[PDB]
Design a protein around this ligand. Structure first.
Ligand SMILES: *Cc1[nH]c(Cc2[nH]cc(CCC(=O)O)c2CC(=O)O)c(CCC(=O)O)c1CC(=O)O
Length: 317
């Protein structure tokens, strides 16, 4: 049996089921039991793992820290869903963008990354804090008299089935995404080789590499989930392009730079050794180590350039 622990929440459940459906397709001759428990929530799922009550936990990659706690690791980086930030609008706005929205219009977001970027880009728009989950945030926009629009993740809206509410997908010139956004991560016990082996199938090499680069960049910057650090990655013609940015809380101050590295997306897998340290919290012992190391190096390089341009001033408000 494969005991998968999940949060009782609707978005946590869907993401969990999606990973389980892939593992099921890879391992049809194995049992999968689902345990539902309800960073307060991250902690109790990690206590179950400790007890061996569950073997896997499925999380969003942006929610995980760059250094996981002792004895845990990210066994699988899944294929990436849309990483972009999207705008949902108030019904009264018949085909508008943030650009065409009236001046002093309120925009709901609890992300400093989004608010910082969007304040700089759309200075004539007010950004207030919105609280709750997608269904709550969507109800508040529709019913209440406060918000003209709300900023949310395309991946998240997509998973709930509510891509019909996406009004505008924001591009990197407007609002670059969070590190690991649109990617699911599978947490596992670091010394359970049998569980790490199974989860190895879920690793997508293109996403894994981009996600190491992004996590390496953030770890070097001393960033985390709730910090105004944003990134954009791509892999085209054997090149990994990493754009990273740092903003002040109001967007007034911002450093943004782009670097690239010759890194090839590996088609084939391997049987790497157990003593290979996990990179940026990730265990990809069945994926070539050459390309992973290069991705981390690229992330570090970009963090080092940003810090040389005083990126630590902007962050330490
Ligand atoms: C680190 C961080 N987490 C969240 C909330 C969140 N977690 C998962 C998603 C869905 C997309 C995905 O799987 O990547 C989301 C995003 C969402 O639509 O809320 C946030 C956003 C803060 C908030 O308003 O909830 C952040 C911070 C950040 O993204 O900058």
């Amino acid at each position: 049996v494969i005991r998968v622990g999940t949060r009782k929440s609707q978005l946590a459940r869907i993401q969990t089921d999606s990973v389980v459906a892939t593992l099921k397709a890879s391992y049809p001759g194995l049992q999968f039991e689902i345990i539902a428990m309800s960073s307060l929530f991250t902690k109790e799922l990690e206590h179950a793992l400790e007890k061996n009550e569950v073997d896997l936990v499925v999380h969003s990659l942006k929610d995980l820290p760059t250094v996981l706690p002792p004895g845990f690791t990210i066994g699988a980086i899944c294929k990436r869903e849309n990483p972009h930030d999207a705008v949902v609008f108030h019904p009264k706005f018949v085909g508008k963008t943030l650009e065409t929205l009236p001046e002093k219009s309120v925009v709901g977001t609890s992300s400093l990354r989004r608010a910082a970027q969007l304040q700089r880009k759309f200075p004539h728009l007010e950004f207030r804090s919105i609280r709750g989950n997608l269904n709550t945030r969507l109800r508040k926009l529709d019913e209440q008299q406060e918000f003209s629009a709300i900023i949310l993740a395309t991946a998240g809206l997509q998973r709930m089935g509510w891509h019909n509410r996406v009004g505008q997908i924001l591009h990197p010139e407007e609002c670059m995404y969070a590190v690991g956004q649109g990617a699911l991560g599978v947490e596992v016990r670091a010394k359970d080789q049998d569980i790490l082996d199974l989860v190895g199938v879920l690793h997508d090499p293109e996403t894994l590499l981009r996600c190491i680069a992004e996590r390496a960049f953030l770890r070097h910057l001393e960033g985390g989930c709730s910090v105004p650090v944003a990134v954009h990655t791509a892999m085209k013609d054997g090149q990994l392009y990493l754009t990273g940015g740092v903003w002040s809380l109001d967007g007034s101050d911002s450093i943004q730079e782009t670097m690239q590295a010759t890194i090839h997306v590996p088609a084939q897998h391997e049987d790497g050794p157990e003593d290979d340290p996990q990179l940026v919290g990730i265990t990809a012992r069945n994926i070539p180590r050459g390309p992973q190391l290069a991705a981390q190096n690229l992330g570090i390089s970009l963090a080092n350039l940003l810090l040389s341009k005083g990126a630590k001033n902007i962050l330490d408000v």
